[PDB]
């Protein structure tokens, strides 16, 4: 028989997942990208910690301790908006596709 770590407190930002871990004992936290290059990373946590993960377009898979894995994907959210004024439109597309935006403009 093995224990299962407490469900973490989770909040979200732009292409970002923030977790608060509350272990009783040392646990292993690890994650991988679900794309071609998994960029596998792992760490041990022996205390309450704030962990910030970056979410790729392909999606991110996160596994903590003996718990079932979580999967996350980004949405096309903006602080700018489509339509409206020309500067509102550029911000909208910049936030979603910043690389291309700088090239097209």
């Amino acid at each position: 028989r093995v224990p299962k770590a407490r469900n973490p407190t989770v909040t979200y930002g732009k292409n970002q997942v923030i977790m608060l871990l509350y272990p009783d004992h040392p646990t292993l936290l690890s994650y991988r990208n679900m794309g071609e290059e998994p960029n596998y990373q792992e760490e041990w946590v022996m205390h309450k910690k704030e962990v910030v993960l970056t979410v790729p377009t392909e999606g991110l898979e996160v596994t903590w301790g003996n718990n079932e894995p979580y999967k996350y994907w980004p949405q096309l959210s903006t602080n700018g908006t489509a339509h409206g004024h020309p500067h509102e439109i550029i911000l909208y597309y910049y936030e979603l596709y910043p690389t291309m935006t700088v090239v097209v403009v």
């Binding site: 970002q16 991988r32 994907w73 959210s77 339509h83 097209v104």
Partner: protein
């Protein structure tokens, strides 16, 4: 009717395909992959497990010299020490201290624990790829299982389903893998009979039950402490124990493309790589002639709202006048917009409601019902949330062509500059013409 389509290997995502058989009503099928498994062929090279060192009681001979013979045990050594004068709890071992020698020997054997606790070193070849496919056929849910090699076709409900070959030969498993339990690792294990001390493979056998054992523990017999009969030695610690502590992450956690790894048998599950061709033999009973099918006229579309939430956040309502009661098939005429419903019912004069998912900031698309296409368009809003636990239901927006509407600013600026060039070009042309004529 033979219908051939190709879908992505992404698991848990439905795809819509249109069946076009002239003279009959267009039909729409829905396909989803429920599971894709890549099961490699393995050939066992050897078993690695813990070893035990066996040391028989030492032979102590005083007033004379001890001797021994070579043995053919997996790792054997024998040595004789001189000048030994051992004591027992009740006094000196023997009467004389002259010409005293001690005969020591030791050998390595496989542990009995190797029966249950061991790692297997395998060579991997190709995989017998197969998949579980869900198909929505004539409103019915049909589930089929088959090999993704373009063979071993299976017929269900008189429909013949052929899947594969796979567009990719990708596997998370390399040529050399080691299996301990539920954890598979990619490791360049050493050749059989070439193991080294303190490292994985220090002790090897071809099978768990085999009596043919290779070992390299660098076991060296040392001189005993004076007054004692103990047999000291120098030997490397088991490489198996070191490996278990230093295994690191297994493929289940490190594999690319979101592959799931399982053992007994070793297999890769639901790898998001490439695509899978599907061919379906459809019975004529599934086709309704256009003369028998219903027909729709006076069709129009409106959009109460649209949000590109990636989860069917768009809604559209289409008004129609039906010639008669019956069913029709609904299909998008663009790859930018996905319609959730495969089919709708039509009766008299009414309206139908469907949901859709798009990456477009401005939705511009045509909806095909029973051969009566309607153009529909509306502005879409962004989602409030940033992160979801599901994959998008739609496809990508990756073309410069799909920029939003109210982009007339681009056309106005481009046209304005183009006009300046066109005018300047005309001015120069006229002057050149006049200059040419003058001599």
């Amino acid at each position: 009717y033979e219908h051939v389509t190709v879908i992505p290997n992404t698991v848990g995502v439905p795809y819509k395909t249109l069946v076009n058989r002239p003279g009959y009503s267009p039909m729409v099928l829905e396909m989803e992959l429920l599971s894709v498994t890549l099961e490699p062929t393995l050939s066992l090279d050897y078993i690695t497990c813990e070893y035990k060192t066996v040391i028989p009681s030492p032979y102590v001979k005083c007033c004379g010299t001890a001797e021994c013979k070579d043995k053919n045990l997996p790792d054997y050594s024998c040595k004789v020490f001189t000048g030994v004068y051992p004591f027992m709890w009740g006094g000196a071992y023997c009467f004389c201290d002259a010409e005293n020698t001690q005969l020591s020997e030791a050998h390595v054997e496989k542990s009995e624990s190797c029966k249950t606790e061991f790692a297997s070193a395998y060579r991997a070849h190709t995989a017998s790829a197969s998949a579980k496919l869900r198909v929505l056929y004539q409103g019915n849910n049909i589930t089929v299982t088959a090999y993704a090699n373009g063979d071993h076709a299976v017929t269900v409900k008189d429909a013949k389903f052929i899947v594969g070959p796979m567009s990719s030969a990708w596997t998370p498993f390399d040529n050399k893998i080691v299996v301990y339990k539920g954890d598979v690792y990619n490791m360049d294990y050493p050749p059989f009979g070439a193991g080294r001390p303190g490292q994985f493979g220090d002790i090897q056998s071809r099978t768990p039950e085999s009596k043919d054992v290779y070992a390299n523990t660098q076991l060296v017999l040392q001189r005993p402490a004076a007054g004692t009969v103990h047999v000291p030695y120098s030997q490397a610690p088991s490489g198996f124990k070191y490996w278990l502590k230093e295994r690191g992450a297994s493929l289940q956690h490190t594999a690319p493309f979101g592959c799931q790894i399982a053992t007994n048998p070793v297999r890769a599950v639901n790898c998001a790589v490439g695509n899978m061709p599907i061919s379906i033999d459809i019975p004529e009973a599934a086709f309704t002639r256009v003369v028998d099918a219903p027909s729709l006229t006076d069709m129009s579309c409106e959009v109460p709202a649209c949000t590109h939430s990636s989860d069917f956040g768009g809604v559209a309502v289409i008004k129609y006048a039906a010639s008669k009661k019956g069913k029709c098939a609904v299909h998008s005429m663009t790859n930018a917009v996905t319609i959730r419903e495969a089919e709708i019912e039509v009766e008299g004069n009414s309206q139908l409601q469907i949901s859709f998912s798009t990456a477009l900031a401005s939705a511009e698309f045509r909806v095909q019902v029973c051969s009566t296409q309607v153009h529909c368009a509306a502005e879409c809003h962004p989602p409030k949330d940033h992160i979801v636990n599901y994959p998008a239901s739609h496809t990508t927006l990756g073309v410069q062509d799909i920029s939003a509407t109210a982009m007339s600013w681009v056309q106005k600026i481009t046209g304005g500059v183009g006009l300046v060039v066109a005018v300047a070009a005309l001015i120069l042309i006229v002057v050149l013409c006049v200059s040419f004529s003058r001599h």
